[PDB]
Amino acid sequence: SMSYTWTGALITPCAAEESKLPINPLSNSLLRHHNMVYATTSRSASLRQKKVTFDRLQVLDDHYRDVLKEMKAKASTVKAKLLSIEEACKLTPPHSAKSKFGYGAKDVRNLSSRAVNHIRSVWEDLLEDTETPIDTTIMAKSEVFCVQPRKPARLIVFPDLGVRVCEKMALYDVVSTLPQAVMGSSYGFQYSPKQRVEFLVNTWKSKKCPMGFSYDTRCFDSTVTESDIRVEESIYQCCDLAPEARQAIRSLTERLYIGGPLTNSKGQNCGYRRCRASGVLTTSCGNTLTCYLKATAACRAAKLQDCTMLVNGDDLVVICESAGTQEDAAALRAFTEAMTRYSAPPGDPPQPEYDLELITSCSSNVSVAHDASGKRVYYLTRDPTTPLARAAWETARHTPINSWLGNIIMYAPTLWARMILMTHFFSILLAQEQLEKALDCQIYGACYSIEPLDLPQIIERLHGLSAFTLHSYSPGEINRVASCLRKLGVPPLRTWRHRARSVRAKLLSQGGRAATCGRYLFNWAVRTKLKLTPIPAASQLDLSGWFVAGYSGGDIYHS
Numbered sequence: 001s002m003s004y005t006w007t008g009a010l011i012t013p014c015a016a017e018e019s020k021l022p023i024n025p026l027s028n029s030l031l032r033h034h035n036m037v038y039a040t041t042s043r044s045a046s047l048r049q050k051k052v053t054f055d056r057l058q059v060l061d062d063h064y065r066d067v068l069k070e071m072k073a074k075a076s077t078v079k080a081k082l083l084s085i086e087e088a089c090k091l092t093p094p095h096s097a098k099s100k101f102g103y104g105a106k107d108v109r110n111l112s113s114r115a116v117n118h119i120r121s122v123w124e125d126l127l128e129d130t131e132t133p134i135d136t137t138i139m140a141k142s143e144v145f146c147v148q149p150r151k152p153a154r155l156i157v158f159p160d161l162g163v164r165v166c167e168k169m170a171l172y173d174v175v176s177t178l179p180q181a182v183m184g185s186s187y188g189f190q191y192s193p194k195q196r197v198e199f200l201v202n203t204w205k206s207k208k209c210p211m212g213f214s215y216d217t218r219c220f221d222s223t224v225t226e227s228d229i230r231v232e233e234s235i236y237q238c239c240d241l242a243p244e245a246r247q248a249i250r251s252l253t254e255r256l257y258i259g260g261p262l263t264n265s266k267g268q269n270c271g272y273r274r275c276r277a278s279g280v281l282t283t284s285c286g287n288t289l290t291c292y293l294k295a296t297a298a299c300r301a302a303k304l305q306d307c308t309m310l311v312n313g314d315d316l317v318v319i320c321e322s323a324g325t326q327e328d329a330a331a332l333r334a335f336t337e338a339m340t341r342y343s344a345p346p347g348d349p350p351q352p353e354y355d356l357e358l359i360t361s362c363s364s365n366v367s368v369a370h371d372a373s374g375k376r377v378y379y380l381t382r383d384p385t386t387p388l389a390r391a392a393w394e395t396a397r398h399t400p401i402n403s404w405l406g407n408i409i410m411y412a413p414t415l416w417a418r419m420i421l422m423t424h425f426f427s428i429l430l431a432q433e434q435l436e437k438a439l440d441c442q443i444y445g446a447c448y449s450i451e452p453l454d455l456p457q458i459i460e461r462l463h464g465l466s467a468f469t470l471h472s473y474s475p476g477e478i479n480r481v482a483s484c485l486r487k488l489g490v491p492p493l494r495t496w497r498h499r500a501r502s503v504r505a506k507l508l509s510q511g512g513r514a515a516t517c518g519r520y521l522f523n524w525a526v527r528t529k530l531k532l533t534p535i536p537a538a539s540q541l542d543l544s545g546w547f548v549a550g551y552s553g554g555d556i557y558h559s
């Protein structure tokens, strides 16, 4: 069937939309080519609509059905718990879209009478009505990028705040534990960046002669069929569930997940969806399971040897035993025709790779550098273009989520995150006296509140002390960063080194946690190195909850 059907009504914004980077005194210090940075808006919604609108073709075979059964057998060991209204409300982010039923996110978190009672009524309705298509709002997503040698806006589809809390009640526990139980070491969200690197590096070095590839599915959400969503539910149903959880899942599947009506910001009937909605709680889990199912069966059809895959939502990376240049190419091509028949056609054409560093998955790649003792250490990195573009936008405007804070956490070991992101933001925070002020960021889609001052501990626990001593990066990594800096008009190392030394001196004079930031975060900027020993508060953090599952679009907040 058609992924989408349009009534002709337009995808409208619910307020003025900013497209250009403001000429701000602070952003310009970070990036000078401001005309190269832009924010996607509803003005390009039509372009995206055309790309994501098409009739899906799907042909299922014995491999598909075989993998499906293997997955179900594992789901059969799970027991989900069903969250209480209160627990569910607590998972709602403070900046979550307000309900249209007389209350907002703050009211939800405060367990206000009007939020709870309405939420209760939406839940009773899921138990009683198993058919009526639940209403969804479709909006053009606002995302920042750097122009290329422009991306149309992404389309987000999400139901009312009331339905969102209900999703959590019924499926939060399911989407947090089932993926790992069914996919094992292949589920990527259970890994922190260092651990994802470990898994990739080990899988790679474990092969006699490794061959790997990333697989980009052209517009994955739209390739998701009604069959995929019901199959997905068949997996969730293998869990021991509370009677009401079971019914809620059944109802949500038929009324929300398989598809439903689309309404714009003006309340006008916009169209109908028969594919994956990006803004629901099961998106990440549903995409991971579906992508894992199709790719696993495709590998079997393609005769790829000793396949090892890692999956994160629609993102897929596979590593296997090479059978020779020619054979590998053919087998990969076969894998693709197999994924195509499963309604998962390729966007970027897949290509075999024999150099781990060149393999890009989850927009990142493994690279290597050396610690103070000259020891080789592998870490995760990525092209810094988008991160810096977004850092500049966030420097000019206030935003609910601060991608720069998340990028510093996830990419702490990198040359670019350390030299620029850390130097730039600590300079601003210290100048505005806001080092104590906790800010929100996202990790695997979930929103977290983090105090800039705890970064030292955090970084040590997640990456190890070597994160503060890496040097001698790969020429490939160095060429990519330098290339990025010239393009965006970012000041050279010498300038950052000077700003970093000043930032550090001030941080040290404040003592306490600030001084701790100055010592560890910016030791690279001084010649007279300091001895970096384990930080006491480090081995006392509870970061385990950070890497359990993906939640992008799931409207999740972790206190």
Ligand SMILES: CC(C)N(c1ccc(Oc2ccccc2C(F)(F)F)cc1C(=O)O)C(=O)[C@H]1CC[C@H](C)CC1
Residues within 6 Å of the ligand: 414, 415, 418, 419, 470, 471, 472, 473, 474, 477, 478, 479, 481, 482, 483, 485, 493, 524
């Ligand atoms: C070796 C020395 C002195 N060095 C580097 C300085 C620049 C660099 O990258 C470049 C080299 C030449 C031109 C442009 C660049 C780039 F634009 F990429 F930075 C790479 C390295 C490194 O450790 O490999 C360092 O000590 C860095 C260690 C990490 C901090 C945070 C910045 C300084």
Ligand SMILES: [Mg+2]
Residues within 6 Å of the ligand: 216, 217, 218, 219, 220, 314, 347
């Ligand atoms: Mg894709």
